[PDB]
Write a protein that binds this ligand. Structure first.
Ligand SMILES: Nc1ncnc2c1ncn2[C@@H]1O[C@H](COP(=O)(O)OP(=O)(O)O)[C@@H](O)[C@H]1O
Ligand SMILES: Nc1ncnc2c1ncn2[C@@H]1O[C@H](COP(=O)(O)OP(=O)(O)O)[C@@H](O)[C@H]1O
Ligand SMILES: Nc1ncnc2c1ncn2[C@@H]1O[C@H](COP(=O)(O)OP(=O)(O)O)[C@@H](O)[C@H]1O
Ligand SMILES: [Mg+2]
Ligand SMILES: [Mg+2]
Ligand SMILES: [Mg+2]
Lengths: 371, 57, 57, 371, 371
């Protein structure tokens, strides 16, 4: 048989068979319900649109994300997402396919317990396993050491690994992510004259963020340039017209990552959390962690983020170290590639949580050595 | 497409200019440390010759 | 003007990358001579320390 | 055939075939265990890193020396050290090679008996012999009289020998050695603001101690000079940057040898113990013993130790006696050179302990007159 | 005239006049700054709130501790704290009162020198003195012999004293303290779904730790009982509501004191460092040190810590030796009690550092015989 790798992620569900070079199905993790009445008789609208289908009917639905920051908050929506992924996207029966799942660090144990219970009971998967996003990202990056910064749409965290050994006491988790950037972009667009409130327009604001935003190497210099020059202004076409032009708002939204004080967060920027995590580790491995800084996740895809973070870390770090940042073009799908590599390994076949073990030891078997 | 190309080219030229200034102060500091090392080594040479003659006597 | 700016970007990136590889060679050779300069400085330092200890004894 | 000359010592295992000019394999005697869990699967980490390999993985290992003060306290670790030495560093099977061993004077008989038992049982060497670490150093110096000061990392001892006749009643042993100096440097570096606690960075502190520490000819004068001027300060580059500068601490660390009261020990200094051992012998050999002082061991490699020790012993000794101290450049490896010279002798071929003799007489053969 | 006894501590400054049964001014040593804008004009807002005033405004300020681990890392904040203590809590002019200060063992010299310089220059005290906290704890206990464990909020150390004589070579210092326990409690509370990130939530977590945490006599048995039954679940009420439930992490947090491996530290627990310090001393005083084990510091009031430490030591110690642990109820303020007692002696009046002495000898006078 063959193994199945499913990555719930946050804001995007991506899945595919193990041993593949890229996920087959990638679609937003959205469950929408019709908010109007409906007057035509005979068509028989369904009561729930799930997945990429909800994007097409975005204008007549209330889009709800089943997960806020890694933690699943609406379980029924998650059974709907998983059922859609397993049946209408891959068209496979999970009765004969082991499933590998990806899960962020420092999350409630009840989350993993319920995930495994749902997988074993509702879908009757023969075996399953839960892994950490950072380890998979390091797998796909062709590395065995180095500190990896995984910044998705749900949560941003750093996990330092040296020689295949993790440093649990040095793991730092920050809840600032892409969703907060989108919300700040909404909050900062209204000062120009454009108001976005409905959950349907969340997608439009996110698309504007993806298509136009970029990280500035220097903040004060760029603001001074934009205060006088107008070469930073670009137009965007809304799905109905009335093009909008944004000036300094394009490079101010991603600055929240390095300046979390913009949205009221007390913590420090990602460039500072990475340095703090490096200094948390032992003194004999700091050089290798400095020389093998790994990036992953969708939020790290902004143009010029690598140069800005390298400059910041070089400013923080001693002047006698070479700071190198690895930013492969496929940052977004790095975790799934690592999952495919991990599931395709032959020695991994004895680390699955089989059905017999789950039945014998209950849902608590997840937190054993089969972490 | 052309505008995007010009955009990343402008970003690249700006960042390489920044690295150029970085290398500029790197050259300044390495030059001054090289000069001080040469001066201290040469002074060490003279004082070594003096103390060697003193050791002989 | 999009095509004109694209051509400007292309020869600009060509010239800046040429200067960049020149700068990489330059920084490498000055880093090397930094190693030799530091080695000679410390050599003179402990040689004079030893000869001064001999002089005092 | 050829004979193997293994010198376990403490903190440095050095070995090689007899008749060689210098030892072939020199590496620290430490055993490392991974103190973390390991997240990457399929790598298959070994459960114990031994020898020079553990120095490269200091940041994810805990280092335990199997020899505290001359004696062996962890026999499994010592067996691992011996196996590594025989099978990786030398790549020679000990089935057809006699071995020559060294240990400090005045050690428990159980240690020697267990070493002999392990070496005949586990490795099945054809023959073996145990020699005092000081007599071999005396051979390596081309002398036949005089006292020898073997200050290693575990223990410091003096053995007076005149015309090849040892004087057991005048042997003095002191437990102060390089390890205590390293610990004292770790303790006194805290007053400057640098904290070293982990066993991994004890090696770093040892590197500073080797590179920068030196013995002062006069203590009060150097103290006044360091308190007034700042020409004695030097800077050391840590493995992760943040260069540190040590001043007055530079020569305070090796002064513990002449001032044992710094670490709380009641025993007298090195020079006083040497003088007491000199006057413990007879009266007709004191002049030759004065004129043939021999230094060996790693700890005796500090710059200016010879001049200070000569000045102190001249102050103690009568004025009309010539005092000379022999300090060859190869103090550290002198014991192994002497061992190789002894094993290359033709008359020594009949002093080996044959396996049949051990079987007939039991492990207590070594302490018997068949030494 | 009367002398002042100011105990800087770490995160809890306690001060008062010498000759009192208890200090009359206890408040956290935190300096807060407003991180928001402030819309109302004419409010007369201050740019810095110190002491217990900042505890009432945690939700609008950012809290910065001027002391990391014993060492003061921010001198402006410490100056503000001292000015507040002298002029508001005590309401006495420091120009006519000698001041007695305390500090931890193995403290960097620059810290103490800068402390004395600040005290002599800014507040212009006539005389001042600095003493080790362990000696004051011994004076307050009414003893004159016995190893004392002073686990505060920044540092934990053991100092053995026999017949009024201290043994510097047997002093063991460990950086594990209350702050690390609070951070570990933060880390492990996320296992249920409660996230505390802002510095304001640190005080909430500290209050939870003080109110609920306790030390288990055995770890495995208590974990088994917690996993099987549900009798250990205790609920705490947040400043708003949503009462939280705490299970085995109620006693898992203080286990870091005996299991420093939880937070990734190499060193052993306090129960083992105490035994190592005991065996570091001589042989003819070990009985009294075993029978006069003294506890002090705020961190040593976990219910059941004394019994657990006694069991651990009796396991380590020889069977024919009796172990006694002294845990006075006034553990937190024992250092201040000893300081007041010591300042009350008429003999001590000649040990003050006069202002003329400091002016003529410079800051280096502090490390002289007037230790
Ligand atoms: N080219 C881009 N530029 C900026 N942001 C992007 C880009 N592509 C994706 N993103 C952001 O990344 C998010 C997707 O992150 P994702 O990798 O799905 O996280 P997870 O792995 O936790 O599901 C989207 O919300 C989007 O805002
Ligand atoms: N030049 C030096 N300066 C300072 N310390 C030294 C020097 N050479 C050796 N040592 C110390 O001596 C120790 C090794 O001594 P060694 O003779 O190898 O002991 P053993 O023979 O018991 O292994 C090391 O711990 C090292 O710190
Ligand atoms: N009953 C308790 N339970 C848990 N922790 C406590 C308790 N009492 C005090 N502490 C801890 O002790 C610390 C205060 O100790 P203290 O002696 O004041 O040290 P310092 O003087 O360095 O502040 C506080 O941070 C608190 O967390
Ligand atoms: Mg992700
Ligand atoms: Mg030796
Ligand atoms: Mg205290």
């Amino acid at each position: 048989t063959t193994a199945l790798v499913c990555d719930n992620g946050s804001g995007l569900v991506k899945a595919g068979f193990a041993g593949d070079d890229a996920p087959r199905a990638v679609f937003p993790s959205i469950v929408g319900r019709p908010r109007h009445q409906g007057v035509m008789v005979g068509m028989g609208q369904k009561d729930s649109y799930v997945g990429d289908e909800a994007q097409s009917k975005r204008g007549i639905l209330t889009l709800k994300y089943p997960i806020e920051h890694g933690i699943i908050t609406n379980w029924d929506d998650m059974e709907k997402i998983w059922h859609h992924t397993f049946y209408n996207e891959l068209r496979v029966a999970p009765e004969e396919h082991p499933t590998l799942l990806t899960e962020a660090p420092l999350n409630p144990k009840a989350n993993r317990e319920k995930m495994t219970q749902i997988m074993f009971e509702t879908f009757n998967v023969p075996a399953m396993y839960v892994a950490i996003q950072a380890v998979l990202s390091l797998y796909a990056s062709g590395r065995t050491t180095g500190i990896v910064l995984d910044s998705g749409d749900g949560v941003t965290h750093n996990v330092p690994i040296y020689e295949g050994y993790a440093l649990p006491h040095a793991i730092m988790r920050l809840d600032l992510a892409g969703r907060d950037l989108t919300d700040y972009l909404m909050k900062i667009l209204t000062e120009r004259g454009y108001s976005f409130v409905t959950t349907a327009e969340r997608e439009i604001v996110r698309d504007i963020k993806e298509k136009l935003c970029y990280v500035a190497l220097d903040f004060e210099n760029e603001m001074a340039t934009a205060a006088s020059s107008s070469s930073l202004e670009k137009s965007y076409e809304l799905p109905d017209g009335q093009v909008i032009t944004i000036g300094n708002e394009r490079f101010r939204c991603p600055e929240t990552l390095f300046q979390p004080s913009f949205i009221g967060m007390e913590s420090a920027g990602i460039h500072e959390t990475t340095y703090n995590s490096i200094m948390k580790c032992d003194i004999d491995i700091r050089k290798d962690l400095y020389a093998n800084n790994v990036l992953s996740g969708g939020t790290t895809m902004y143009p010029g983020i690598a140069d800005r973070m390298q400059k910041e870390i070089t400013a923080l770090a001693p002047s006698t170290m070479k700071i190198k940042i690895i930013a492969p073009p496929e940052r977004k799908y790095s975790v799934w590639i690592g999952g495919s590599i991990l599931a395709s390994l032959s020695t991994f076949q004895q680390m699955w949580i089989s059905k017999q073990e789950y039945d014998e030891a209950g849902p608590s078997i997840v937190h054993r050595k089969c972490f | 497409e052309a505008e995007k190309a010009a955009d990343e080219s402008e970003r690249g030229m700006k960042v390489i200019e920044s690295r150029a200034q970085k290398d500029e102060e790197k050259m300044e500091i390495q030059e001054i440390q090289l000069k001080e090392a040469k001066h201290i080594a040469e002074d060490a040479d003279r004082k070594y010759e003096e103390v060697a003659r003193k050791l002989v006597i």
